[PDB]
Subunit: 416 residues, 3 copies
């Protein structure tokens, strides 16, 4: 039973084994001058992995933001809801700004030049500011859904979800059942896409093996230092995010951070091992139960925080969208970084935590900046940043779960 041996084996150790064997086989076949053979016989598996993730980008955008804007809408929110939603959004924006800062303080992907076709990627000239601020609103929702265009789909999905929740509180019965049926169908589409991404991340060791094999064979030993710089920038940014943001917010609101980080050890460690937010929700509820938090103020925010409070994933956005920019020669302008901040805050507003979906949110961010996955240079830089996704997901899920308990404790010790 080779198939039942392969699936029952755990995912994280499998991707780590595929990554290590991919680096070894890629460097060995790159020393022997076998780069074109390993290219034409190995690289299509990683291309299939990249194409499966790019397939799963857009329905996750539409359905997840409809459901999440249906879970965040001002039609059904109290004081605790607004009080923690403004905290979650204002923390995600400062986390992606810290990701920009930590990508500027290091140099992820410098030195290497990824002109794979013989020409560098030249960025198309930016429109005026009012043209992009008007082109956020789509002319056609099916049109903006039918070819790329992450930001108009984001706007239309948020507006449609807020309208669905305003529809579910009317005196009529037929429109209430109709809005409930539409919201349940879109929620089923979102959860079906999450089951497909669970299957794709089950396939993911072979794709990581192929991508890292081709990358180590073509670029050489010179790329593992820049990947180590990427890992160092991400983990230093996450540690400084935890320290600065959560510790200063807890000391302003009067909660001692050492006892908090002692009590949150289980909720951090099971998110480090099992790289999921929805899978660590009973452990997070147990940690919030053993802290002194009231029942109706932790039994509402933690299922909301497992959906709308990706704090480390936005820092990974801010580091990775600058690594992919610096690994192509170009650089992002001021006015293209606020697009990263907007499309890293509004993307993590409905996505439930499944392992390996930051690789989908990365294409969501890149498709709105001007670095699309159709050009051959971004498809190589995204491969280089996708090959080390498993050693970053364990980092960017722990702070994603830590921010939930931080916001729950801050909202708890300002009302009672």
């Amino acid at each position: 039973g080779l198939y039942r041996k392969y699936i029952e084996y755990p995912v994280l150790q499998k991707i780590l084994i595929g990554l290590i064997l991919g680096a070894i086989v890629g460097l060995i076949l790159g020393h022997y001058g076998y780069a074109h053979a390993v290219h034409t016989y190995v690289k299509p598996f990683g291309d299939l992995f990249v194409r499966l993730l790019c397939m799963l980008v857009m329905p996750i955008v539409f359905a997840s933001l409809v459901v999440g804007a249906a879970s965040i809408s001002p039609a059904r929110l109290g004081r605790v809801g607004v009080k923690i939603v403004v905290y979650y959004l204002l923390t995600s924006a400062f986390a992606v700004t810290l990701g920009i800062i930590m990508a500027r303080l290091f140099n992820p992907g410098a030195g290497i030049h990824l002109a794979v076709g013989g020409q560098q990627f030249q960025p198309h000239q930016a429109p005026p500011l009012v043209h992009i601020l008007l082109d956020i609103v789509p002319t056609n929702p099916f049109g903006a859904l039918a070819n790329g265009q992450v930001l108009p789909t984001i706007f239309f999905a948020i507006i449609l979800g807020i309208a669905i929740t305003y529809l579910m509180n009317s005196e009529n019965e037929k429109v209430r059942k109709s809005a409930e049926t539409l919201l349940d169908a879109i929620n089923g589409l979102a959860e079906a896409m999450y089951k497909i991404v669970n299957g794709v991340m089950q396939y993911a060791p072979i794709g990581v093996f192929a991508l890292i094999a081709y990358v180590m064979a073509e670029q050489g030993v010179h790329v593992v230092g820049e990947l180590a710089k990427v890992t160092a920038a991400v983990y230093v940014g996450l540690t400084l995010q935890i320290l600065l943001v959560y510790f200063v917010l807890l000391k302003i609101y009067g909660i001692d951070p050492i006892s908090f980080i002692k009590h949150a050890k289980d909720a951090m460690l099971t998110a480090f091992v099992t790289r999921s937010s929805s899978g660590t929700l009973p452990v997070t509820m147990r940690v919030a139960k053993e802290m002194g938090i009231s029942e109706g103020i932790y039994s509402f925010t933690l299922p909301l925080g497992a959906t709308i409070n990706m704090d480390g994933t936005a820092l990974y956005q801010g580091v990775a969208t600058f690594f992919i920019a610096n690994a192509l020669g170009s650089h992002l302008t001021v006015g293209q970084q606020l697009t990263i901040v907007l499309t890293a805050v509004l993307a993590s507003i409905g996505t439930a935590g499944v392992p390996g979906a930051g690789a989908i949110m990365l294409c969501m961010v890149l498709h709105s900046v001007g670095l699309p996955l159709t050009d051959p240079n971004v498809a190589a830089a995204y491969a280089m940043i996708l090959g080390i996704d498993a050693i970053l997901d364990m980092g960017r899920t722990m702070v994603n779960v830590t921010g939930d308990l931080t916001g729950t404790a801050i909202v708890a010790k300002t009302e009672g």
Copy 2:
């Protein structure tokens, strides 16, 4: 509480105030030579209003015509249903023909030449008649839904709704629950789009202010006379529609029109004040109760007439699609006017009455004629016709409610 002051204030007086202040500020800044400044600092708000309405065009088309063809279908209709549906369609066609006649008898938008880019809008050459009569049927329903193409979406939506009602009367159970689930999801999409257009028409005073400010600053005082000609043509056409059509039909069918128009005073006046058809449905039912109409012959037609019997909105189509044509230098050919008649009859077959959706049906009509909102001349002429939408909606809702009671009385006094 500036926001709760702004929303709780009524909509119609707000749009009238924004229109008057927009005309005043536009003429004053046009006398001082400040046209480029008011352009680049004011016109994007009206562009955002136009882009929100153009966003809301196409899902209203698909979902509203699926629901309305599900409410008009020959699978579930008696004698009264066919007897009033053929009346409603044959009255809407003659109303849009009277709109064409009243646009020809006046001259809406003559004299002005809207070459904003330095070139006039040249119409693309028409295909043969059998090419457009075959291109009514789409090759791809998702394809015709994904880029414009109002008439193929209209055809596919009507066919899908008739198929849904033929599906809901079968002996099986699974396909009955499946058709009910699909129809309820599409109905929820339609009502969600109507809640979005209620929000957009709540935003609408700032957009009307910006559009009329830019229009009075660029074109000058010479455009308010043509807008007055448009209002005069619309209201003369609506008054002659009421008089000729309803009075001669009531005198042929033997009902005295003076006592009818005395009894229908509440249903006319509350539709003039509150510019809605669904909002005046209990008042219309009360007026039909105080007329001598049988219970099962007024308790069926008035919720149907509030959906499929827009008689004044089609006259506004027939006047406005000729105003936008005459304000660009071109003229509509015979064979392009039957497209206006078809896309003004089939558009008002599922749309429930919400205030300010004639501006969406106008883009529905214009996108099928050859005057799309992407070219810069039609986006200015549509702005000029959109800035005075509030002083036309009160006119074109009163006859829209009057035709309901007229058809109810005609169908009542031919059976009992």
Copy 3:
């Protein structure tokens, strides 16, 4: 009552009458040199028929394969399910291979050259093998759904259906109701498309009359011999399919074929007369009851076999996609025939049997080979193969029902 006379008249005799009168009127108007008049005054009706079928292609693909992959998925299958699903797929593949063989052994559509615009259809050059094997997976599911692209829609629909069934077996309640709501909405879309194709095949006599009239007037008497060669190739292939495949499989598994083909006479004959698979399901259940088949092993496979076991329809695919290739001068390469095998196996995985849907599966096959219905030569060859669809559907439904009882008997006499 001309309309109620026309609809209540049976469909098959109506299409046969339209075919015979179309051939007669086409040959008579072709002898008098009246080809351009019968073209410009008759051919648009057949073009409307072709456009209605091309409209109904793509939603049947998406919805039918979502439902059929939801009915074939490995999440809910026993030993009997896998045992008969691998039989059905391995029989459909050998049936379409026998269709390729029977199209090679005859010469369907040779001699005639269909350069209607003055130029022959030149095939676009094929990409490498790994490019098409990677382009099976879409980059955008709404994108691949929005312009043609049958194979990416097929892949995404099968993956989404398997994910829906894996979603309907979880411990949560909200995601179970959500997956059930999404699957029921897609099933309602599929059954609505089947009701539309029932209406289009009700219209079909006028379209068959127009297509055969234009074909006999333009090409002449020389095309009825090649159409007779097509009918002979299809029926010889179906008879050899029955004989070889079913008789050798029944003699290997130890069931006497003469008593089987004596008992299956009702289920063959009512499928020959009423050309449907879902309409002959009680007769097929009655035949399996009068054979010696256990209750839980014939009450599961025959509603599955009426959906996923089109054996003669795949042979009609294999003959017709080579007739349309040979009637244009070009020829299909090895590597374009495995596309026919794949898109003739995976297409008949969710489609319930309705009369005249092989004309839709033919466009499904042709749109993935490189013979699209937009070029004017394939739109004439598809007309020539569509005009004789009624005298082929009776053949390709009988073996479609016979394979159900064959697989049921084979699966029955290997377990008990």
